[PDB]
Design a protein around this ligand. Structure first.
Ligand code: FAD
Ligand code: FAD
Lengths: 488, 487
């Protein structure tokens, strides 16, 4: 065949491009490597009636305006989330804010200065802000915080996801934190009836657009200019059937770093040379649904780290105004190196493009043992962070740990695991690297070509965005490229 | 041109192949991507008269017989090393041995069983040893230790490089540790006048062998069979001049995982599909040479959080030859400390050896980190810091900003090697859960593009049966040697 515009990748950014480009009236095609699914890192499975987000769960719409706007324009609402909470002059909580504000030269409690910062200011910071003579775009976040007259000590033990041991671009993670440290963005909200709800609504308005053919099961595996000097692109697309060959005047790669690296030979050196301007962090989620929970409503998230190979362990029960069975659900949410523990419980090598539910008992076998220890210890202490129901407090007192194991192992109705470090994602999210001038990459990536000046290839997505980690970045990224695509 | 046998890679295994193949009488050529140097991961720089090993330092010749033998046959001596030292029935140092011996079903004090274990036994372990129904070749080391009736909890926050958070092949790291846990070893030896001494001696006997042309500055960047079905190989070799094109009847890839992955398109799928059967661990060394040390004459290596490092090792001159009283500090670190320091290599693009005295910012940050710890060590005294009386006092009095500067000034020369960098991509490698090592080593020892020619080979530590050590690199060389007939 032949098409005006191909879009490789049907993730949030792939599709926000497939929308705005339809609304200006182009003949779009959306290749998407996955047969049945759409929205990539957006994953919401229903597990014994619980909404289990294998991908994003909450959002800060005040911070992520363009998210709200794609939510609004699509009829997606946001149920505000009200869920549970959690060496001298250096005596506070988290408050890397001290570290940042020292670097920026302000008072370590100058929260007005922080709340007044614009994107325009963030750009001025990233380009021009220095620390001990060095630009911050050239430094580790970890190094800038450890400098003469900053911190140390540095607690990665404790804290949320600040990517200290990954040592990201100082400027870009000073920027990122100065954002989430504004007074707003405490407004925390789920998406009504799942996060994948947003995927659906975007296809339901992307079906009522005539000039859009959505083509699941299609994976871009090649790109050549047809003739030297000319803008016509040859796309090798492998699919279910077999190895088709599309042609287009404009290809949009809505792909994170790992797919792009698998395409690296088929890309201009000047672009392919920079795909390593970001690192993909792995994250891994495990969900267990328990018949007979040991925790009440409002049991706080813990930071198990030791007790379990996990970072966070999150706790869910059905609303107390329902509870048709009284069941509950546990999220093990983990980064490096806990990810390496669980990685190996995906039974299918070769392919892992979505959660594996109820396919390895060994995942429960290891969840059981780890919790079994902790809930014999929590009965006694009572000053343990594990609330523990009266029913559970007693019955555990009596069972021989080896049986507390089995009680929990039996208790599991359904369980699932998503290892986001696996192809074709290779990461839950990405981070700029020390040395990188993000703005040089984002400009090069938004629009490029094989050497005609055609400006008819694009990269879009979170990975090389100005708001990494969030759908907002994926959206900012889509726009940057949209602006370089004229009407038909 | 055209050659009997090319050997890509002039590291220890590349060269032990270039030797034994000369001694059977082939017309060898050794390509080596590095212009000036040989022996790759073997790196020994002289720093204000100190032997600084950016690569291997010590060795266990009892455990590594084939190392001793290549040392002996080359006139390389080993100065035995006598350097400084270091919840219910679960309260010791090497609860690791507890964990292993639980898995293996023996008594956690069965040290005779351990000392009696042969290679043939290690193979039987690899292939057949199970845990809760699962073969260990299929498990994480971390998972096997955390099992019902083993450990937990697991202290990786202590300990010397056990690769728990890298979660390596349970069987292959049970094997690896059961080796270094023999009493037989622990006999620790440096190499006489540096570790790179062994590189030199191997070229000095590799010069007196007529049928060997050594070609530094040459990097294999492609391999095609000349004709479909026929054993003739086309080598694209980039060099100083430019892009020559050799031909050979037999190519030996003495290369770790990362260069082989850069050649992955030029390799048979059946081989390239398995290069990810191992992980390359990054390690990073920084060396500082200090005018006026702050530490005692037996100051133990520490396990520093306190610094972004894992080990911090302490050196003075043999004080029988100490003409200035100087001392040296080795920051030796794994993930994630590696990420802190890696950014202080001033040359992007290329890093094939240590960068000495090329970034003051490395001292600037060493100073501050130690400056804190040695103001705390003046007072507490309940510290591993054997601080000298001269140092204990003078530090008491100086402000941080001056304690930093005292140390910053004290530094004569400093260096950094980031082994995670091309073309090494790792200080050493580890088998992965799922892998049957023995299936990989058999596939790798000899293969071809489909003729049956059996005229390509992979050799080196990375896919060896003794990962981490030169012994593995040597075991690997042999496996392939055995499949190469005499001329
Ligand atoms: C920090 C550290 C500590 C160590 N400690 C010990 C120890 O205590 N005990 C011990 O026994 N061993 C130790 N070792 C082992 C050491 O790694 C040995 O040198 C050995 O493992 C190297 O095996 P190799 O032959 O694969 O060497 P390599 O150096 O990996 O050989 C590869 C060579 O090929 C080259 N090359 C790469 N690409 C190309 C190309 N395309 N064409 C041509 N040439 C190419 C160069 O990279 C290099 O010279 C240590 C290593 C390190 C780094
Ligand atoms: C653990 C986790 C936590 C998150 N937390 C938050 C959060 O707190 N707040 C927030 O706002 N967002 C969060 N997110 C969301 C994340 O920011 C976005 O979902 C994502 O980054 C944006 O999607 P994308 O379009 O950029 O890329 P992706 O969703 O990765 O899109 C890639 C798509 O390309 C496809 N594809 C098509 N053709 C090819 C091909 N040839 N090769 C490869 N792939 C191909 C598929 O791989 C895939 O569907 C989280 C995500 C995860 C996984």
């Amino acid at each position: 065949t032949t098409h005006d515009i191909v879009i490789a990748g049907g993730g949030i950014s792939g599709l926000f491009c497939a929308l705005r480009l339809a609304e200006a009236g182009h003949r779009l095609l959306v290749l998407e490597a996955a047969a049945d699914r759409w929205g990539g890192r957006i994953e919401t499975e229903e597990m014994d009636g619980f909404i289990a987000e294998y991908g994003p769960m909450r959002f800060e719409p005040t911070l992520q305006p363009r998210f709200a706007a794609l939510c609004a324009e699509l009829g997606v609402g946001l149920v505000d989330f009200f869920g549970p909470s959690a060496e001298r002059g250096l005596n506070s909580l988290q408050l890397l804010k001290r570290g940042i504000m020292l670097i920026m030269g302000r008072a370590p409690d100058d929260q007005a200065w922080i709340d007044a910062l614009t994107e325009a200011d963030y750009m001025r910071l990233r380009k021009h802000a220095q620390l001990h003579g060095q630009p911050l775009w050239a430094m580790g976040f970890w190094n800038a915080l450890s400098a003469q007259g900053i911190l140390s000590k540095l607690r990665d033990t404790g804290t949320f996801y600040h990517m200290i041991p990954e040592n990201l671009n100082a400027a870009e993670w000073i920027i990122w934190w100065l954002r989430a440290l504004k007074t707003v963005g405490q407004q925390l909200a789920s998406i009504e009836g799942g996060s994948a709800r947003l995927t659906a609504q975007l296809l339901a308005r992307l079906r009522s657009h005539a000039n859009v053919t959505l083509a699941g099961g299609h994976k871009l595996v090649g790109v050549r200019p047809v003739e030297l000097g000319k803008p016509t692109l040859a796309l090798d697309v492998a699919t279910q059937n077999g190895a088709v060959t599309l042609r287009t005047e404009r290809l949009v790669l809505a792909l994170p770093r790992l797919p792009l690296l698998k395409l690296t030979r088929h890309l201009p050196e000047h672009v392919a040379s920079q795909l390593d301007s970001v690192n993909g962090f792995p994250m891994l989620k495990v969900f267990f649904v328990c018949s007979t929970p040991w925790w009440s409503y409002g049991q706080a998230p813990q930071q198990y780290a030791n007790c379990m190979p996990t970072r966070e362990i999150h706790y869910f029960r059905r609303p107390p105004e329902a509870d048709a069975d009284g069941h509950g659900m546990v999220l093990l949410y983990m980064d490096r190196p806990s990810t390496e523990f669980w990685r190996h419980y995906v039974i299918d090598g070769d392919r892992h493009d979505r959660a594996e539910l109820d396919q390895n008992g060994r995942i429960v076998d290891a969840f059981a043992l780890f919790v079994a220890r902790d809930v014999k210890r929590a009965a006694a202490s009572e000053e343990s962070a594990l609330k523990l129901t009266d029913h559970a407090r007693r019955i555990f007192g009596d069972l021989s740990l080896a049986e507390t194991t089995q009680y929990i192992r039996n208790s599991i109705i359904t369980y699932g695991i998503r290892d986001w470090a696996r192809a074709p994602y290779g990461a839950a999210n990405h981070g700029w690297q020390p040395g990188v001038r993000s703005w040089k990459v984002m400009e090069a990536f938004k629009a490029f070509d094989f050497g005609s000046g055609a400006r008819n290839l694009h990269i879009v997505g979170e990975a090389y965005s100005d708001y990494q980690g969030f759908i907002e970045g994926a959206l900012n990224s889509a726009e940057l490229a949209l602006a370089t695509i004229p009407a038909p």
